[PDB]
C-alpha cells in the first residue's frame, strides 16, 4: 500500500484499527552532487520537479540563444562598415575583439 | 480586548498562542481539542426485519362451497379450491368424491425477533458540530463542551469565548441512512409504501410497535397436493436477509477524512477537515503590567538537536539574564516552528531548554520569549523512521525544504542567465552608439 | 403512464383536470386541498420565566466575627456587615454596642409558577410541507395526508401519485422563535449564557426541570437598617415581565400570505404562496375504450348568463344528441374560464347546464365535452358587490378585460399610423422613380 502524509488505516479481522502516517525521509542527499539532489526532490516532490526543470531549461535556452543572437548582430554591425570599403583595413583592436581576419 | 484567531480541526494536538497588548505583559492562551462530534438532524421513517408468512388453517366443507371473507391483513391472499379429497390421520375426511372445497388463506406478519433484530431507515440533513475543548487562558483552565456555531459562548472568569462555525459544510452522512446493529450505512432505501419484493424494505413498519405494516412480498397461493391438508404458497425471499448478504461495508470503514461513526446518537468523530475560528472577549483585568513579570537582557539562542521529524524533534537552548525568577510565555510568531510548552520558568542567570517541531531543513525563526525576540538558527537532519503512528505536529510551509545547495543552483542557473542577457543588451547598445558615432563623420 | 401537472397552493378551491389519451376515454381527475401545513425543524435551547430572589436568614454572632461560605447558588451574593445592633420582638438580641456581625445571603431561583407560565426559546430551520388532500381519479375517491417532498407516494387502486416539492422555500418563521401561551414570536433572543438583566432571558434554564439555571439579574446586597433583622437587596426588575409588556404582536397577526400560526407542534397553515407540482403514474387498466362511453354528435354551446365576478357567475347551455346516456367529463383546456363541476350526466337528447367562472368581458373559450369540442362565445357583465368574502376562483390573464371597443380604438390608433407611414414610403419610392424617368431624357 501507499501511505502518504495525510494518513492510512487498516483493520485485520478482529484487531483494532492501526493508523499510520508517512514522514518525509526521501532517498538521496539534498546537500551536494547535483544528480543526487534531483533524485531527492523527484522522490520528494514529483510533480513540481519536472515543471521546475522544464522552466529553468527553457529560460536558460532562451537566454543563451538570445545572447548569442545579440552578440552576432553586434559583431555584424561592427564589422560591416569596415567590410564595404574596397581597401579593407579592419584596425587591430577590432581584429582582436571581434575576431576578424 | 477582542482577540480573534484560528484553530485547525484536529483532535489530540494542543494549540498554543499568546496575546500581546502593546504595553503590558503577554497573556498565553492554550486550547487542546479532545473530541469533536458531528450530529446530524436525524428523522426516522420506518424499520424493517424478517417477515413471517402466517397461514390460517384450511376451511374444509364436505359437499358444499365456501367463500372468501377478507380480513385486510398485510398482503392477505385468499383462494378457494374445489375438487379436494383430504386425508387426516384417522382416515379420509369427506365421503363426497367431488364438490368439496378447501380455502387457503395466507398473510404476512413480521417476525418474532423484530424487536432486537431490525434496521432503522432514517433521513439526515443539516448537521451540528460540538467539541470538547480544554481551554487555558492565563493559567486558568476549564474543560467545557463548547458548541461551534457562531454563538453560544463559554464563560469562565469573565472571559467570553465564541468558537465560530466550521469552514466546511461537509458531512459523511448522506440524505438517507440505514442503521443496523450499531453500524450505519449510506443506503438509498425506498420510501414508505414503495417497498419492493425481494429487496430492502419489503416489510415497512412505521415504528417498532406501529401495528400497521406495509408488505409487498410477492405472495401467491398454490393448489394443495391431492390428499393433504396444507396451505402451499410461493413468495420472494426475505429482502432484509438479501440486504444482509450483500451489505457494502459500513461507514465506520469507508468514511473520508478518517471519521469514527458511532451509534446511540448517530454522530461522526474526529473528522480532520475544516478549521475552527475563535473569538476572545477578554476583560481588561487579566492584562498584567510589564514590570510584574520577568524581562530578559542579553539573551542568546542555540540549537542542540534538530531533526525535521513529525513530533518535537528539535531542541533550542536559550542562555538568558533577567532580574526576576518567574515564568513567562514562549511563542514562535511564524508557523516555522511549533513549540511544545507554552511557558518557561526562569531563574536569574540560568538556561532554558525548549522543544520545537519543524519541517525545515535550514530553520531560521525568531523566537519570542518573555517580551523580547531572539533568533534561533541551525540545520535540521532527516529522521530515521519512514512511517510513524501519530500525526504531524507542524505545518508544511511552501518552500520549506529547499536546501541551500539547491538555492545556489537556482540562483546561478536562473539569475546568471539574466546577467548574460543584460551584458548582451549593454554590448548591443554600445555597438549601436559606436556605429552612430562612426557615421557622424560624413 | 406519466401525467405531470401543477396545482396552485391554496386550500379549499377544487382543482379539476382530465387525461386525454389519444384513442381511449378521457379520464377525469379532481384534487381539492383541505389543509396545507408548513412545519419547521424546531430545537429547544432554553426556557425562561419570572424569577424569585431567594434569601437566607441572617447569621448574627454576638461580639465575634463571621466569614463567607459559598453555596454556589445562581447569582449568589454574600456580603458581611459589621457594627450591628439587631432586634427581636423580645428586646435586643445581642448585648454589645459594636463588634456584632450579620451575614446576608441572597440568590436567584426560578419561580414557583415556572411550569405553567414560561417562554420556550426555539430555533427553526428547514421546513417540511405536508398537505391533507382529497383525490378523485376516475370515480375512485380517497382522503389521505400527503407529504409534498418529491417522493413518499400515495397509493390507491394502483395509481401512484407523488406531490412534488414547493416552488418556494418561504417560511413565516425566522431563525429564532419564542413560544408563549399558544402564540409564536420571531424574536432574537440572547444565547444561553448571554443573558442580560432587565431583558429577556436574564433567567435561562436549559429545560423546564433542568435543575441548573443561568441567572444574570444584577443582584446587589445592601446594608440593613439599624435595629432590624432583614436582608436588603437591590436588583434589576424581571425581564420576562418587561418582555410581556413590550410584546409586538404574534405571528398569527403579522405573517404575510395569509398564514395561520398554530402550535400543537409549531406550524403554519394555509399560506397562499407557491404551487404544488403533481406526478401521476396511471396504470394501463383504467383506460376504457371510447365505444363503451357516450359520444356526442351535433353539440352546440350558448351562454345564458355571464358575469365576470369572482365566484361561478356564468351559465352555459349545451344542447346535444347523444349516442348513449351516461356521465362523462367536461373540461376547459385553457385558464380562460374555470368550470364548477368535473362531470355531467347525460340523457340521449337533453340539454346540459354547466357553471363556469371567468374574468373575460368577451369570453371565447372552447369547451371539451365527452370527446367533442364546442365553442362557447358571449359577453359578460359587471357584478354588483364591490367586496366579497371568498377568494378568486379563476385566473388573471393578461389582456383579459379589453372590452372590444377598446380593441377598436387601439387598432385604429396603432394601425392607421402604420398605413400612413407605408403609403408615405411608397409615395417616396414612386417620386424617386419619376425623377429618374424625367431625368433620363437628359
PDB file of N, CA and C in Angstrom, chain C residues 209-292:
ATOM      1  N   UNK C 209     -37.345  21.331  33.813  1.00  0.00           N
ATOM      2  CA  UNK C 209     -36.956  20.720  35.076  1.00  0.00           C
ATOM      3  C   UNK C 209     -35.468  20.405  35.074  1.00  0.00           C
ATOM      4  N   UNK C 210     -34.654  21.373  34.657  1.00  0.00           N
ATOM      5  CA  UNK C 210     -33.248  21.110  34.377  1.00  0.00           C
ATOM      6  C   UNK C 210     -32.383  21.063  35.626  1.00  0.00           C
ATOM      7  N   UNK C 211     -32.810  21.726  36.706  1.00  0.00           N
ATOM      8  CA  UNK C 211     -32.057  21.860  37.963  1.00  0.00           C
ATOM      9  C   UNK C 211     -30.672  22.471  37.753  1.00  0.00           C
ATOM     10  N   UNK C 212     -30.549  23.364  36.772  1.00  0.00           N
ATOM     11  CA  UNK C 212     -29.340  24.158  36.575  1.00  0.00           C
ATOM     12  C   UNK C 212     -29.756  25.373  35.762  1.00  0.00           C
ATOM     13  N   UNK C 213     -29.801  26.546  36.389  1.00  0.00           N
ATOM     14  CA  UNK C 213     -30.254  27.738  35.701  1.00  0.00           C
ATOM     15  C   UNK C 213     -29.159  28.789  35.667  1.00  0.00           C
ATOM     16  N   UNK C 214     -29.160  29.560  34.590  1.00  0.00           N
ATOM     17  CA  UNK C 214     -28.278  30.701  34.432  1.00  0.00           C
ATOM     18  C   UNK C 214     -29.008  31.958  34.873  1.00  0.00           C
ATOM     19  N   UNK C 215     -28.464  32.652  35.867  1.00  0.00           N
ATOM     20  CA  UNK C 215     -29.077  33.861  36.393  1.00  0.00           C
ATOM     21  C   UNK C 215     -28.084  35.004  36.289  1.00  0.00           C
ATOM     22  N   UNK C 216     -28.462  36.050  35.559  1.00  0.00           N
ATOM     23  CA  UNK C 216     -27.720  37.309  35.498  1.00  0.00           C
ATOM     24  C   UNK C 216     -28.755  38.401  35.726  1.00  0.00           C
ATOM     25  N   UNK C 217     -29.018  38.735  36.989  1.00  0.00           N
ATOM     26  CA  UNK C 217     -30.123  39.620  37.331  1.00  0.00           C
ATOM     27  C   UNK C 217     -29.687  40.916  37.999  1.00  0.00           C
ATOM     28  N   UNK C 218     -28.376  41.174  38.085  1.00  0.00           N
ATOM     29  CA  UNK C 218     -27.789  42.386  38.679  1.00  0.00           C
ATOM     30  C   UNK C 218     -28.185  42.528  40.149  1.00  0.00           C
ATOM     31  N   UNK C 219     -28.090  41.428  40.884  1.00  0.00           N
ATOM     32  CA  UNK C 219     -28.417  41.404  42.300  1.00  0.00           C
ATOM     33  C   UNK C 219     -27.281  42.008  43.115  1.00  0.00           C
ATOM     34  N   UNK C 220     -27.608  42.989  43.953  1.00  0.00           N
ATOM     35  CA  UNK C 220     -26.651  43.660  44.827  1.00  0.00           C
ATOM     36  C   UNK C 220     -27.240  43.688  46.230  1.00  0.00           C
ATOM     37  N   UNK C 221     -26.435  43.326  47.227  1.00  0.00           N
ATOM     38  CA  UNK C 221     -26.851  43.372  48.624  1.00  0.00           C
ATOM     39  C   UNK C 221     -26.590  44.739  49.239  1.00  0.00           C
ATOM     40  N   UNK C 222     -27.525  45.197  50.064  1.00  0.00           N
ATOM     41  CA  UNK C 222     -27.421  46.486  50.729  1.00  0.00           C
ATOM     42  C   UNK C 222     -27.243  46.287  52.225  1.00  0.00           C
ATOM     43  N   UNK C 223     -26.992  47.391  52.923  1.00  0.00           N
ATOM     44  CA  UNK C 223     -26.760  47.318  54.362  1.00  0.00           C
ATOM     45  C   UNK C 223     -28.071  47.483  55.117  1.00  0.00           C
ATOM     46  N   UNK C 224     -28.370  46.621  56.090  1.00  0.00           N
ATOM     47  CA  UNK C 224     -29.661  46.701  56.783  1.00  0.00           C
ATOM     48  C   UNK C 224     -29.774  47.911  57.691  1.00  0.00           C
ATOM     49  N   UNK C 225     -31.016  48.234  58.031  1.00  0.00           N
ATOM     50  CA  UNK C 225     -31.322  49.366  58.888  1.00  0.00           C
ATOM     51  C   UNK C 225     -30.889  49.082  60.311  1.00  0.00           C
ATOM     52  N   UNK C 226     -30.539  50.134  61.038  1.00  0.00           N
ATOM     53  CA  UNK C 226     -30.115  49.995  62.424  1.00  0.00           C
ATOM     54  C   UNK C 226     -31.263  49.454  63.266  1.00  0.00           C
ATOM     55  N   UNK C 227     -31.037  48.305  63.888  1.00  0.00           N
ATOM     56  CA  UNK C 227     -32.052  47.705  64.723  1.00  0.00           C
ATOM     57  C   UNK C 227     -33.125  46.963  63.968  1.00  0.00           C
ATOM     58  N   UNK C 228     -32.741  46.160  62.980  1.00  0.00           N
ATOM     59  CA  UNK C 228     -33.700  45.410  62.183  1.00  0.00           C
ATOM     60  C   UNK C 228     -33.007  44.190  61.603  1.00  0.00           C
ATOM     61  N   UNK C 229     -33.650  43.034  61.719  1.00  0.00           N
ATOM     62  CA  UNK C 229     -33.145  41.790  61.153  1.00  0.00           C
ATOM     63  C   UNK C 229     -33.887  41.574  59.842  1.00  0.00           C
ATOM     64  N   UNK C 230     -33.228  41.905  58.734  1.00  0.00           N
ATOM     65  CA  UNK C 230     -33.726  41.614  57.398  1.00  0.00           C
ATOM     66  C   UNK C 230     -32.546  41.650  56.444  1.00  0.00           C
ATOM     67  N   UNK C 231     -32.760  41.107  55.250  1.00  0.00           N
ATOM     68  CA  UNK C 231     -31.771  41.122  54.183  1.00  0.00           C
ATOM     69  C   UNK C 231     -32.246  42.123  53.132  1.00  0.00           C
ATOM     70  N   UNK C 232     -31.650  43.304  53.048  1.00  0.00           N
ATOM     71  CA  UNK C 232     -31.988  44.223  51.967  1.00  0.00           C
ATOM     72  C   UNK C 232     -31.163  43.942  50.723  1.00  0.00           C
ATOM     73  N   UNK C 233     -31.785  44.169  49.572  1.00  0.00           N
ATOM     74  CA  UNK C 233     -31.126  43.911  48.304  1.00  0.00           C
ATOM     75  C   UNK C 233     -31.716  44.816  47.236  1.00  0.00           C
ATOM     76  N   UNK C 234     -30.927  45.040  46.196  1.00  0.00           N
ATOM     77  CA  UNK C 234     -31.350  45.803  45.035  1.00  0.00           C
ATOM     78  C   UNK C 234     -31.015  44.995  43.795  1.00  0.00           C
ATOM     79  N   UNK C 235     -31.955  44.908  42.856  1.00  0.00           N
ATOM     80  CA  UNK C 235     -31.687  44.220  41.603  1.00  0.00           C
ATOM     81  C   UNK C 235     -32.566  44.781  40.503  1.00  0.00           C
ATOM     82  N   UNK C 236     -32.130  44.550  39.268  1.00  0.00           N
ATOM     83  CA  UNK C 236     -32.897  44.978  38.113  1.00  0.00           C
ATOM     84  C   UNK C 236     -34.168  44.143  38.013  1.00  0.00           C
ATOM     85  N   UNK C 237     -35.288  44.740  37.622  1.00  0.00           N
ATOM     86  CA  UNK C 237     -36.555  44.010  37.624  1.00  0.00           C
ATOM     87  C   UNK C 237     -36.597  42.926  36.559  1.00  0.00           C
ATOM     88  N   UNK C 238     -37.679  42.163  36.608  1.00  0.00           N
ATOM     89  CA  UNK C 238     -37.786  40.934  35.840  1.00  0.00           C
ATOM     90  C   UNK C 238     -37.965  41.245  34.365  1.00  0.00           C
ATOM     91  N   UNK C 239     -37.162  40.596  33.526  1.00  0.00           N
ATOM     92  CA  UNK C 239     -37.211  40.864  32.106  1.00  0.00           C
ATOM     93  C   UNK C 239     -38.237  40.060  31.356  1.00  0.00           C
ATOM     94  N   UNK C 240     -38.761  39.004  31.964  1.00  0.00           N
ATOM     95  CA  UNK C 240     -39.865  38.285  31.350  1.00  0.00           C
ATOM     96  C   UNK C 240     -41.152  39.087  31.456  1.00  0.00           C
ATOM     97  N   UNK C 241     -41.325  39.812  32.558  1.00  0.00           N
ATOM     98  CA  UNK C 241     -42.458  40.721  32.675  1.00  0.00           C
ATOM     99  C   UNK C 241     -42.303  41.925  31.758  1.00  0.00           C
ATOM    100  N   UNK C 242     -41.089  42.459  31.636  1.00  0.00           N
ATOM    101  CA  UNK C 242     -40.868  43.573  30.720  1.00  0.00           C
ATOM    102  C   UNK C 242     -41.002  43.142  29.264  1.00  0.00           C
ATOM    103  N   UNK C 243     -40.652  41.899  28.956  1.00  0.00           N
ATOM    104  CA  UNK C 243     -40.889  41.370  27.621  1.00  0.00           C
ATOM    105  C   UNK C 243     -42.371  41.152  27.357  1.00  0.00           C
ATOM    106  N   UNK C 244     -43.134  40.734  28.369  1.00  0.00           N
ATOM    107  CA  UNK C 244     -44.588  40.688  28.222  1.00  0.00           C
ATOM    108  C   UNK C 244     -45.193  42.074  28.072  1.00  0.00           C
ATOM    109  N   UNK C 245     -44.574  43.093  28.665  1.00  0.00           N
ATOM    110  CA  UNK C 245     -45.075  44.447  28.472  1.00  0.00           C
ATOM    111  C   UNK C 245     -44.746  44.971  27.087  1.00  0.00           C
ATOM    112  N   UNK C 246     -43.617  44.566  26.509  1.00  0.00           N
ATOM    113  CA  UNK C 246     -43.304  45.061  25.171  1.00  0.00           C
ATOM    114  C   UNK C 246     -44.129  44.333  24.115  1.00  0.00           C
ATOM    115  N   UNK C 247     -43.808  43.047  23.860  1.00  0.00           N
ATOM    116  CA  UNK C 247     -44.569  42.091  23.042  1.00  0.00           C
ATOM    117  C   UNK C 247     -45.256  42.623  21.792  1.00  0.00           C
ATOM    118  N   UNK C 248     -44.480  43.009  20.785  1.00  0.00           N
ATOM    119  CA  UNK C 248     -45.033  43.216  19.456  1.00  0.00           C
ATOM    120  C   UNK C 248     -45.803  41.966  19.030  1.00  0.00           C
ATOM    121  N   UNK C 249     -46.954  42.117  18.358  1.00  0.00           N
ATOM    122  CA  UNK C 249     -47.956  41.037  18.278  1.00  0.00           C
ATOM    123  C   UNK C 249     -47.460  39.762  17.612  1.00  0.00           C
ATOM    124  N   UNK C 250     -48.264  38.717  17.786  1.00  0.00           N
ATOM    125  CA  UNK C 250     -47.884  37.349  17.494  1.00  0.00           C
ATOM    126  C   UNK C 250     -47.693  37.133  16.006  1.00  0.00           C
ATOM    127  N   UNK C 251     -47.284  35.930  15.663  1.00  0.00           N
ATOM    128  CA  UNK C 251     -47.043  35.682  14.260  1.00  0.00           C
ATOM    129  C   UNK C 251     -48.322  35.310  13.532  1.00  0.00           C
ATOM    130  N   UNK C 252     -49.416  35.064  14.247  1.00  0.00           N
ATOM    131  CA  UNK C 252     -50.682  34.863  13.563  1.00  0.00           C
ATOM    132  C   UNK C 252     -51.367  36.166  13.195  1.00  0.00           C
ATOM    133  N   UNK C 253     -50.758  37.307  13.502  1.00  0.00           N
ATOM    134  CA  UNK C 253     -51.311  38.598  13.147  1.00  0.00           C
ATOM    135  C   UNK C 253     -50.436  39.377  12.183  1.00  0.00           C
ATOM    136  N   UNK C 254     -49.152  39.047  12.090  1.00  0.00           N
ATOM    137  CA  UNK C 254     -48.208  39.791  11.277  1.00  0.00           C
ATOM    138  C   UNK C 254     -47.635  38.984  10.123  1.00  0.00           C
ATOM    139  N   UNK C 255     -48.024  37.728   9.957  1.00  0.00           N
ATOM    140  CA  UNK C 255     -47.360  36.946   8.921  1.00  0.00           C
ATOM    141  C   UNK C 255     -47.978  37.244   7.562  1.00  0.00           C
ATOM    142  N   UNK C 256     -47.167  37.354   6.518  1.00  0.00           N
ATOM    143  CA  UNK C 256     -47.726  37.542   5.176  1.00  0.00           C
ATOM    144  C   UNK C 256     -48.335  36.281   4.598  1.00  0.00           C
ATOM    145  N   UNK C 257     -48.916  36.407   3.402  1.00  0.00           N
ATOM    146  CA  UNK C 257     -49.532  35.329   2.624  1.00  0.00           C
ATOM    147  C   UNK C 257     -50.680  34.636   3.352  1.00  0.00           C
ATOM    148  N   UNK C 258     -51.299  35.297   4.324  1.00  0.00           N
ATOM    149  CA  UNK C 258     -52.492  34.770   4.957  1.00  0.00           C
ATOM    150  C   UNK C 258     -52.273  33.565   5.839  1.00  0.00           C
ATOM    151  N   UNK C 259     -51.113  33.457   6.474  1.00  0.00           N
ATOM    152  CA  UNK C 259     -50.778  32.236   7.184  1.00  0.00           C
ATOM    153  C   UNK C 259     -51.442  32.211   8.554  1.00  0.00           C
ATOM    154  N   UNK C 260     -51.652  31.002   9.068  1.00  0.00           N
ATOM    155  CA  UNK C 260     -52.378  30.784  10.316  1.00  0.00           C
ATOM    156  C   UNK C 260     -51.490  29.989  11.265  1.00  0.00           C
ATOM    157  N   UNK C 261     -50.829  30.668  12.195  1.00  0.00           N
ATOM    158  CA  UNK C 261     -49.834  30.019  13.042  1.00  0.00           C
ATOM    159  C   UNK C 261     -50.536  29.244  14.149  1.00  0.00           C
ATOM    160  N   UNK C 262     -50.315  27.933  14.192  1.00  0.00           N
ATOM    161  CA  UNK C 262     -50.827  27.068  15.243  1.00  0.00           C
ATOM    162  C   UNK C 262     -49.667  26.399  15.958  1.00  0.00           C
ATOM    163  N   UNK C 263     -49.902  25.968  17.193  1.00  0.00           N
ATOM    164  CA  UNK C 263     -48.907  25.199  17.930  1.00  0.00           C
ATOM    165  C   UNK C 263     -49.538  24.099  18.776  1.00  0.00           C
ATOM    166  N   UNK C 264     -49.832  22.955  18.164  1.00  0.00           N
ATOM    167  CA  UNK C 264     -49.700  21.746  18.965  1.00  0.00           C
ATOM    168  C   UNK C 264     -48.257  21.265  18.751  1.00  0.00           C
ATOM    169  N   UNK C 265     -47.776  20.980  17.478  1.00  0.00           N
ATOM    170  CA  UNK C 265     -46.408  21.387  17.147  1.00  0.00           C
ATOM    171  C   UNK C 265     -46.415  22.716  16.420  1.00  0.00           C
ATOM    172  N   UNK C 266     -45.262  23.379  16.354  1.00  0.00           N
ATOM    173  CA  UNK C 266     -45.179  24.689  15.725  1.00  0.00           C
ATOM    174  C   UNK C 266     -45.314  24.553  14.218  1.00  0.00           C
ATOM    175  N   UNK C 267     -46.327  25.208  13.656  1.00  0.00           N
ATOM    176  CA  UNK C 267     -46.615  25.076  12.234  1.00  0.00           C
ATOM    177  C   UNK C 267     -47.402  26.289  11.767  1.00  0.00           C
ATOM    178  N   UNK C 268     -47.296  26.568  10.474  1.00  0.00           N
ATOM    179  CA  UNK C 268     -48.173  27.483   9.766  1.00  0.00           C
ATOM    180  C   UNK C 268     -49.135  26.677   8.911  1.00  0.00           C
ATOM    181  N   UNK C 269     -50.343  27.197   8.730  1.00  0.00           N
ATOM    182  CA  UNK C 269     -51.311  26.526   7.879  1.00  0.00           C
ATOM    183  C   UNK C 269     -51.889  27.499   6.869  1.00  0.00           C
ATOM    184  N   UNK C 270     -52.185  26.975   5.680  1.00  0.00           N
ATOM    185  CA  UNK C 270     -52.945  27.627   4.622  1.00  0.00           C
ATOM    186  C   UNK C 270     -52.298  28.912   4.130  1.00  0.00           C
ATOM    187  N   UNK C 271     -50.978  28.916   3.980  1.00  0.00           N
ATOM    188  CA  UNK C 271     -50.311  30.034   3.331  1.00  0.00           C
ATOM    189  C   UNK C 271     -50.575  29.974   1.835  1.00  0.00           C
ATOM    190  N   UNK C 272     -50.941  31.110   1.248  1.00  0.00           N
ATOM    191  CA  UNK C 272     -51.238  31.171  -0.181  1.00  0.00           C
ATOM    192  C   UNK C 272     -49.997  31.636  -0.942  1.00  0.00           C
ATOM    193  N   UNK C 273     -48.974  30.789  -0.918  1.00  0.00           N
ATOM    194  CA  UNK C 273     -47.732  31.042  -1.634  1.00  0.00           C
ATOM    195  C   UNK C 273     -47.327  29.752  -2.335  1.00  0.00           C
ATOM    196  N   UNK C 274     -46.687  29.893  -3.495  1.00  0.00           N
ATOM    197  CA  UNK C 274     -46.143  28.750  -4.192  1.00  0.00           C
ATOM    198  C   UNK C 274     -47.214  27.914  -4.870  1.00  0.00           C
ATOM    199  N   UNK C 275     -46.786  26.734  -5.316  1.00  0.00           N
ATOM    200  CA  UNK C 275     -47.648  25.847  -6.082  1.00  0.00           C
ATOM    201  C   UNK C 275     -47.072  24.440  -6.040  1.00  0.00           C
ATOM    202  N   UNK C 276     -47.944  23.442  -5.934  1.00  0.00           N
ATOM    203  CA  UNK C 276     -47.530  22.048  -5.812  1.00  0.00           C
ATOM    204  C   UNK C 276     -47.533  21.426  -7.207  1.00  0.00           C
ATOM    205  N   UNK C 277     -46.397  20.952  -7.709  1.00  0.00           N
ATOM    206  CA  UNK C 277     -46.425  20.076  -8.880  1.00  0.00           C
ATOM    207  C   UNK C 277     -46.881  18.683  -8.501  1.00  0.00           C
ATOM    208  N   UNK C 278     -47.511  18.014  -9.452  1.00  0.00           N
ATOM    209  CA  UNK C 278     -48.032  16.680  -9.237  1.00  0.00           C
ATOM    210  C   UNK C 278     -47.428  15.723 -10.245  1.00  0.00           C
ATOM    211  N   UNK C 279     -47.415  14.448  -9.878  1.00  0.00           N
ATOM    212  CA  UNK C 279     -46.918  13.391 -10.740  1.00  0.00           C
ATOM    213  C   UNK C 279     -47.900  12.238 -10.666  1.00  0.00           C
ATOM    214  N   UNK C 280     -48.493  11.894 -11.799  1.00  0.00           N
ATOM    215  CA  UNK C 280     -49.429  10.789 -11.882  1.00  0.00           C
ATOM    216  C   UNK C 280     -48.771   9.626 -12.600  1.00  0.00           C
ATOM    217  N   UNK C 281     -48.841   8.446 -12.004  1.00  0.00           N
ATOM    218  CA  UNK C 281     -48.399   7.215 -12.643  1.00  0.00           C
ATOM    219  C   UNK C 281     -49.650   6.358 -12.793  1.00  0.00           C
ATOM    220  N   UNK C 282     -50.377   6.587 -13.879  1.00  0.00           N
ATOM    221  CA  UNK C 282     -51.652   5.923 -14.110  1.00  0.00           C
ATOM    222  C   UNK C 282     -51.376   4.595 -14.802  1.00  0.00           C
ATOM    223  N   UNK C 283     -51.896   3.482 -14.303  1.00  0.00           N
ATOM    224  CA  UNK C 283     -51.713   2.204 -14.989  1.00  0.00           C
ATOM    225  C   UNK C 283     -52.595   2.111 -16.230  1.00  0.00           C
ATOM    226  N   UNK C 284     -52.340   1.073 -17.020  1.00  0.00           N
ATOM    227  CA  UNK C 284     -52.977   0.909 -18.316  1.00  0.00           C
ATOM    228  C   UNK C 284     -54.294   0.147 -18.251  1.00  0.00           C
ATOM    229  N   UNK C 285     -54.832  -0.098 -17.062  1.00  0.00           N
ATOM    230  CA  UNK C 285     -56.118  -0.770 -16.958  1.00  0.00           C
ATOM    231  C   UNK C 285     -57.282   0.191 -16.776  1.00  0.00           C
ATOM    232  N   UNK C 286     -57.022   1.419 -16.322  1.00  0.00           N
ATOM    233  CA  UNK C 286     -58.093   2.382 -16.094  1.00  0.00           C
ATOM    234  C   UNK C 286     -58.645   2.963 -17.385  1.00  0.00           C
ATOM    235  N   UNK C 287     -57.913   2.858 -18.487  1.00  0.00           N
ATOM    236  CA  UNK C 287     -58.316   3.486 -19.741  1.00  0.00           C
ATOM    237  C   UNK C 287     -59.357   2.621 -20.435  1.00  0.00           C
ATOM    238  N   UNK C 288     -60.617   3.022 -20.314  1.00  0.00           N
ATOM    239  CA  UNK C 288     -61.707   2.385 -21.030  1.00  0.00           C
ATOM    240  C   UNK C 288     -61.632   2.780 -22.504  1.00  0.00           C
ATOM    241  N   UNK C 289     -62.105   1.892 -23.379  1.00  0.00           N
ATOM    242  CA  UNK C 289     -62.246   2.220 -24.788  1.00  0.00           C
ATOM    243  C   UNK C 289     -63.296   3.311 -24.979  1.00  0.00           C
ATOM    244  N   UNK C 290     -63.234   3.970 -26.141  1.00  0.00           N
ATOM    245  CA  UNK C 290     -64.158   5.063 -26.433  1.00  0.00           C
ATOM    246  C   UNK C 290     -65.577   4.536 -26.589  1.00  0.00           C
ATOM    247  N   UNK C 291     -65.728   3.383 -27.240  1.00  0.00           N
ATOM    248  CA  UNK C 291     -67.028   2.837 -27.611  1.00  0.00           C
ATOM    249  C   UNK C 291     -67.848   2.338 -26.431  1.00  0.00           C
ATOM    250  N   UNK C 292     -67.289   2.281 -25.227  1.00  0.00           N
ATOM    251  CA  UNK C 292     -68.051   1.901 -24.049  1.00  0.00           C
ATOM    252  C   UNK C 292     -68.524   3.109 -23.255  1.00  0.00           C
TER     253      UNK C 292
END
